[PDB]
Scaffold this active site. Sequence first.
Site, mmCIF file in Angstrom:
data_model
loop_
_atom_site.group_PDB
_atom_site.id
_atom_site.type_symbol
_atom_site.label_atom_id
_atom_site.label_comp_id
_atom_site.label_asym_id
_atom_site.label_seq_id
_atom_site.Cartn_x
_atom_site.Cartn_y
_atom_site.Cartn_z
ATOM 1 N N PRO A 172 37.306 28.865 26.707
ATOM 2 C CA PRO A 172 38.733 28.640 26.494
ATOM 3 C C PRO A 172 39.438 28.140 27.765
ATOM 4 C CG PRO A 172 38.460 30.903 26.987
ATOM 5 C CD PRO A 172 37.079 30.281 27.065
ATOM 6 N N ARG A 182 30.767 32.627 33.935
ATOM 7 C CA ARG A 182 30.354 33.840 33.221
ATOM 8 C C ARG A 182 29.210 33.563 32.226
ATOM 9 N NH1 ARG A 182 35.676 37.042 30.883
ATOM 10 N NH2 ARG A 182 34.066 38.476 30.080
ATOM 11 N N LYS A 197 30.934 23.093 26.563
ATOM 12 C CA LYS A 197 32.107 22.411 26.095
ATOM 13 C C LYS A 197 33.315 23.221 26.587
ATOM 14 C CE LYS A 197 34.790 22.844 22.737
ATOM 15 N NZ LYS A 197 35.997 22.668 23.594
ATOM 16 N N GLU A 200 39.526 21.418 25.864
ATOM 17 C CA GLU A 200 40.060 20.084 26.112
ATOM 18 C C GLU A 200 41.410 20.147 26.876
ATOM 19 O OE1 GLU A 200 38.545 20.982 23.198
ATOM 20 O OE2 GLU A 200 36.770 19.719 23.566
ATOM 21 N N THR A 252 39.462 34.423 17.326
ATOM 22 C CA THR A 252 38.656 35.157 16.353
ATOM 23 C C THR A 252 38.222 34.277 15.188
ATOM 24 O OG1 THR A 252 39.737 37.174 17.104
ATOM 25 C CG2 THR A 252 38.592 37.298 15.005
ATOM 26 N N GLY A 255 35.450 31.887 16.414
ATOM 27 C CA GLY A 255 34.260 32.703 16.653
ATOM 28 C C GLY A 255 33.534 33.149 15.400
ATOM 29 N N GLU A 272 33.252 36.645 22.802
ATOM 30 C CA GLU A 272 34.375 37.466 23.243
ATOM 31 C C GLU A 272 35.575 36.834 22.537
ATOM 32 O OE1 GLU A 272 35.090 39.608 27.011
ATOM 33 O OE2 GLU A 272 36.682 38.133 27.340
ATOM 34 N N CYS A 306 42.516 37.871 27.550
ATOM 35 C CA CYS A 306 41.813 38.640 26.517
ATOM 36 C C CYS A 306 42.003 40.150 26.729
ATOM 37 C CB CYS A 306 40.317 38.290 26.532
ATOM 38 S SG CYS A 306 39.878 36.903 27.631
ATOM 39 N N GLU A 403 47.800 39.705 18.549
ATOM 40 C CA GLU A 403 47.739 39.335 19.966
ATOM 41 C C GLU A 403 48.854 38.332 20.308
ATOM 42 O OE1 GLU A 403 43.943 38.385 22.839
ATOM 43 O OE2 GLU A 403 44.097 37.217 20.984
#
Lengths: 505, 505, 502, 502
Positions: A172, A182, A197, A200, A252, A255, A272, A306, A403
């Site tokens: 992200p 990471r 990736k 963008e 989410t 994912g 994550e 996060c 969130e």
Amino acid sequence: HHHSSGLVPRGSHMGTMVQLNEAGLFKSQGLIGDKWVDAENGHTLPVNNPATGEILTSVPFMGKREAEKAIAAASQAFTSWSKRTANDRSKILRQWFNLLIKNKDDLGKLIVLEQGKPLAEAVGEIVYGAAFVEYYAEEAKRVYGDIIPSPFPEKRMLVMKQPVGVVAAIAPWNFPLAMITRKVAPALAAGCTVVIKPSELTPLTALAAAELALQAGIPPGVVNVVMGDAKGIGDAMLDSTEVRKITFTGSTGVGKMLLAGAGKTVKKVSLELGGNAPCIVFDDANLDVAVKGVLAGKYRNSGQTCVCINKIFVQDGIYDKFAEAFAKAVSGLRAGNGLEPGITQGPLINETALEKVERHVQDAVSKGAKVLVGGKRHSLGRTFYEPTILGNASDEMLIFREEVFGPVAPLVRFNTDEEAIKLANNSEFGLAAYAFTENITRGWRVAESLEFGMVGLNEGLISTEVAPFGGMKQSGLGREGSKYGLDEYLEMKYVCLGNMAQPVG
Amino acid sequence: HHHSSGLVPRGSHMGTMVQLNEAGLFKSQGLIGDKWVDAENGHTLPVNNPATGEILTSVPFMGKREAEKAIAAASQAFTSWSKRTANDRSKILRQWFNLLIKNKDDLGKLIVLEQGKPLAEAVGEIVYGAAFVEYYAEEAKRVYGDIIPSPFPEKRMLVMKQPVGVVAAIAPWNFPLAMITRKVAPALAAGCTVVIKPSELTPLTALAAAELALQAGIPPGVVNVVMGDAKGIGDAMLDSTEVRKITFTGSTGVGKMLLAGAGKTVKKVSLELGGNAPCIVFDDANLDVAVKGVLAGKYRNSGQTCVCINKIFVQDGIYDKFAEAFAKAVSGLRAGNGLEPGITQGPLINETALEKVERHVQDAVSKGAKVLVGGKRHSLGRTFYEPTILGNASDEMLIFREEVFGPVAPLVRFNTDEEAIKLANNSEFGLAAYAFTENITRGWRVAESLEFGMVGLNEGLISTEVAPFGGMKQSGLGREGSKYGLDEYLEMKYVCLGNMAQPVG
Amino acid sequence: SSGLVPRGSHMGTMVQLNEAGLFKSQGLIGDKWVDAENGHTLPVNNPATGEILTSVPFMGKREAEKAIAAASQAFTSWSKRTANDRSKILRQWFNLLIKNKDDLGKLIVLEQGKPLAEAVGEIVYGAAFVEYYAEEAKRVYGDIIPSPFPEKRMLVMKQPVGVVAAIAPWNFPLAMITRKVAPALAAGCTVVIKPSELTPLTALAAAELALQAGIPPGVVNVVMGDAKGIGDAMLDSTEVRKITFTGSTGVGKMLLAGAGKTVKKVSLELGGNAPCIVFDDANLDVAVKGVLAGKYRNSGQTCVCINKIFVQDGIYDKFAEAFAKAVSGLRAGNGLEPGITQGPLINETALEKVERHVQDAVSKGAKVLVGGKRHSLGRTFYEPTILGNASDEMLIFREEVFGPVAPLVRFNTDEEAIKLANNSEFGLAAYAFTENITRGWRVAESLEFGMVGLNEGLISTEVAPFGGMKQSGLGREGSKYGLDEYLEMKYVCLGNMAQPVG
Amino acid sequence: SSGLVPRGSHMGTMVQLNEAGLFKSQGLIGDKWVDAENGHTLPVNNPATGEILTSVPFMGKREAEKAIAAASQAFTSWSKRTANDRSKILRQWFNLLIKNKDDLGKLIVLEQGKPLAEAVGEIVYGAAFVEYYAEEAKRVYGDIIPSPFPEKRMLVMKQPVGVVAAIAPWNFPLAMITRKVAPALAAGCTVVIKPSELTPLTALAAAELALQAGIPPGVVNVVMGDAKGIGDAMLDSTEVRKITFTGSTGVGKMLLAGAGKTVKKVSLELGGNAPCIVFDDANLDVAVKGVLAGKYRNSGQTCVCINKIFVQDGIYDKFAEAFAKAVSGLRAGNGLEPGITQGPLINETALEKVERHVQDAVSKGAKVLVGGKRHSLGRTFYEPTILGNASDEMLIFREEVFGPVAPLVRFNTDEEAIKLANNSEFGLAAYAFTENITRGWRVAESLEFGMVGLNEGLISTEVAPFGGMKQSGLGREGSKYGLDEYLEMKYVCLGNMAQPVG
């Protein structure tokens, strides 16, 4: 070449872009194998500074075809990279770590330009993101196998751990370096190759990091960077049988789609996803520790993390003192351009992010919340939002259930410890949670009871490369950081030797 | 009650069914919480003896509603079970292990009745399956957390490991006890509760195992057993937010469907899917070890195991000696009823399994394979197939590309070590592989090179509870057995304590 | 006057122990229960009544050599069994110890004197080491290390050290045997164990049950008598590869020095002098209950007992008052009588040390708040005592009292108490009572002791590593680490290795 | 006659070392480079030329006490730094050792005599321990153990032991320093190291580079001179909590015995007598190359060197012939000369032991196949030797020769060779050559030695645990386990704990 010539667009922070470009860290192409490349049709997408609205540069708008070429380059490089000694990969990864640290001031400025966070936070992100590279350079040499006592006298049993293969990584925009490292550092340490990736919205830091990986001696094809049509690239990663593992950090919904898509080739998947971190301030909290901790845990990166504190449960006895001191602390924050010293709040990434913050604030105020500080767009305009505290928040509010990813702190009053813990645990989120209490028994009890992957106890800043980070429930699968983070990029192998003899004498 | 009365159907092996029933191990109902239950509409499915065609009993044909009730019972039981000490769960699991071993002769006979394997193999499966219960009773007390050196002087960092929650387990028919215990034992040890759906072909052993779990003091709701509409039960398990983890052993197609379905609630998923095990017999293999090892690795359970040898690559120099001695060894096998002493081959589970074996044999013979032994249905009829060896097999044959799950051994001639290893690694399978060589360097090299989760080196029988079992590539996710098997049922939690003081003096 | 005239006052208990096969008057060497070579014996007396229970052999150098030879002969086969095979046999021993716990607890009461609840608790605790290491035997994991040389592969194997010589004290007549024998047997070692001549009967009952469990002859051997002579035979033997000892610092130092000449692996647990810090923010009830249990367990005769209590100025008066009330509820007497919570001190030497510590403290200004004299029962019963106004100049502050005496030292700051706690050559157990998370963790990290109870007075467990720092010991007992004391690591380097294919 | 008249024959190398700040003639105590208190010195001579390189201080008890006090003072702050902070500083030291490896290798050649390729290799190897433990400092993991008591929680912390006293031999003047100093510093300990008085210059150069790396004064201290007096100061000090030693068995046993009186943690690596078994199915080229490297590395002056070779009857003649051809290619001389593969023995005592072993073997029937006399260069150069027809009655079979002599013992069965290899009180390194997987694994498991090379003559690495069984040592160096020697475990039991909610 006259100053009136418009080939390089004139603009603010041009001195910083020239310095980044002279350092070889300002890229406008992706990386596939031994070549920096454009998209096959020459299409591009702009990268803009969220604080000024100005163009930094354009990057390629790639898709399925380019992602397939990146996967083929990673697959070709994997044979040799995976067969090197751990010591050999460790030296090269340490060379990459040293280059990231050597260029941290310029790299920090690039994060500010594309993502907008304050420079102190961006340089801190370089130190933190580079820490994963150092950690896994050391951990590469500690991929230990086992010898297990065999219950059969004539057999011996071993466990080997070997790299999974080509990894597809999707990152992200909120930590443009640390989210790349990471994922890339443990994968390379294990002996995997990667196709990454980046977002963008923030791809330049990933490309600068890949340039420095090449300078460190990371062979071509071991690291590949593609961007553009996120849907098309993702589908190429999911459809490839050579991609043995996918790692994703993001929303989410995306994912869950990737997890579902990975099923058809049985890929290893680690993610994550969104968090909704509760923070419990008990009556016996040290007030200064709680105020300082919640200030840091909530408003770091203007709330765009996060692990950020999303909702604060404050016990009845400390409510008034906490609300007063917390308001005073938040009033000291200052919004602006991250390249200006003294700025502690950057802009939200885009208009969609600002609309979500406004939606959460409007919903809370409609349902009875009290605006104690902020509660409106900042005077700077664009996507700057005033740091906000909403008192008298409740479980029926959108900010409680979802969130916010912005600088808004809702306060929920509670009576008993059991009430707060049950309320904290009543969601499908399970990433970070926080608690403030001076009592040993209460502290340990709340830390054990919380159904979250990470708990800060009298601590608002928990991020580190040395500990396992990730989610429970719908917040993720797998862990990043620590010795365990490397296991995500390895496959265990049990070897049973038969026809073995008994020792002599 | 006159002997002519037909309430209990008269048949062969009635003495064994009466003895099982007197021992409380012959069940015709599922288990949900504190009740043995029928399906809501009273519908049932028959369980037949594959060697005689006779009815053993009927079990309920349950679906979505019953699976939801089982999940609610497991969720209710989880709170108390997960909060017991590891020592408390360990004592109860050891009581279950002792009861499984005490009743092994009767339980072995039940496996023979419903699945058909020889009695020696069925009693061996009880010892092996019960070994997982003992292993994880011991491992429950060894779920160790960590204290990590903190790079921040004012913070301390811990890692706790806690049970994931309600587990949904789906098991196949080939090991009716061991496939239940491999999943249930680690889940219960960690502090999870389970809803298990055994194969509708072999459900009686799972129900006997659950009766003994209740006798051991495992509380109601901690273990629940449902069967019938596998699709409907599976969907209830996937749709439930309380089911935090799914574990499946079975076909690749069903496993991929479950993996895809699990994505929408981000469940932890571990699977063991189809394998296609290559076996490499090098020129310097010890001939007797290779013949004995391939006989055992291929024809155990009449070839109906995930780890069975599916294709044998024999080096040019040893080909003729191996083919001759291997044929002599296979000619000694004897097919029949598993309750008859001296029988070493049981029937295939059903007509679909027999049709697949015939399809593989026909395809190989059409493409040039030579039938060295067997190659036809056994004189006993039903689903008994003669143990077969097919010489001059090739990579274009169905038996080379796909899992036969039957007593057929194809032999592929090869010239170089590199040729055999590259051929062994050229598939999407990655469960078991085997190699026979007396040389240290060649043995270790082949074991490291093989892209399989388990490698037998001079060993045809590798199964054990002490080592991690599972697949790479499209053969699975996660591991069963060993200390690592318990990690599949736990969630890691990083706890960061802040505002910490420096030690004194 | 007709009737049974017994020699002892618990004949019914002794007859029940003897009917259970747990009352032995011989040592164990290989496949034989034996007397000393000259038939000499030593009496074993009940410390509460003064009565002889039985006599055991008075063995020396010759018998210890025969025990070592039996252990050496048994080692070859025992060490080559699978871990699974040793584990089943050790679990059979654990089950027999638990099955016979009520009778075994009574035997500990008879020869050592502690209350029956504590003695049965010691059987559960001591047997837990047998269960723990039966499970851990199968978890002796080796390693495969990534090699920096492409042509080499590197392994670590862990294999049993060999014959172990174990020497145990009298204060825990079962748990001190099993915490040494269980890991040794689990690893694949054989043992020659010398229990204390004061409490040998429980060790012999434990060995009888080991034989019943299927532990082969020679794997466990028990000898007693001339402790000096047995110890010298253990140190002089080249087949004894490891020594384990629990007891006095002086004897432990002598054994460590003697072990040097054959380079034996040595692990020991010696004297402790445990400080206990009660901070101002301690939960008073938790501190009083914890200090009472930590100090008066086994009438103060444990190496983890609280020896000195540092109480912060703000809580001093409330703690002293509530702690005196709790100590006044303790009851001394025969351990087989219900309601008894204090047994007698092992012998007159132990009593004389307690009296020496109490008269030194009173001469230097200590105030007797409770007790401070021999109990009305006489013998070696001493009244549970609290000594206020204690100081760093007193013998009880500097040395291990090993009796039911609790001195209280007033302090002002946290830093003062921690520096004072750390200012000795002892390093076994330490205790602290505080409700604050930062203070609790800080004191636990700062203490230079092998074991720290934080808001806990009873810390003993088989699952955690126990032992001393500084002059309180070497090595650890309990936990996965306890097994490493009985193992030798082996690095195996395979050369001329090939690169993987494709 | 005008011109430079040097005292030594490698002045250009000494000037280059001195310009690099790596040629020292003083010890290091705290923040000062110091002489002995009375100004007494001892010469350090080049073993190839007999020439004095420089003199170093002849220190004793007083200087060792000052070094211990400096280490004790520095320990408080060093041990409380984060592991990350210590790791960065240790990595700076590693980088400086590698940056200066060519000059440091030449210094080892000058004072110890080994060939330059071996000396530069020793710098890479010795510096690898510094890198390894810089990484391992951050991996000192504690534990959280499941508690069988619902109201208690159990932790294990691991903390530095304290001041370490390290004593090193002359055969690896850098690697023996770093394999002790690196883990000690990584754990958070401080050190007082006494290098061999024969090769102190490399230890002093290493300490200069440690200071350049940012290692604070007092964390590393270097003293030399009266080895007996320094050793006694280290053993008598209560602040020295751990002793580490590499060297002779007699001195190690004396130190072990002396350490007992303060219950110090002791780790040591003593004499070895490595058997090497060449089976019939060995790959001949691998065995010849491996035995040549394993035996003649450092002219046989290593505690892992092959001391005796057991060759199976079927391969005996082919092995003896090919091994003689390989040994004849070795070249003795000054280590700074290209092509030299054998350096001189450290001194006349070392040479006399080699001559004693060769004359004992020849008197008992050994056949000199190659060498067997002092080299034509004189001094302490001995010709690489092979002694055929060797036997278990010979001094070279029973004791460590520590020289370039290879005795060959013929054997018939695998069981015979293994039992013979295991029939000594040594237990450091052992070697075996076989192409068969079953035989290879069986011999590796059966050997009662801490380290086994299987088809490998060069097994030394920082990543694996190295040390001895039986009378060859205690503890391990290298690998994650090497760090545990410098740490004390602490069990912390938290009480009055609550049950989790919901």
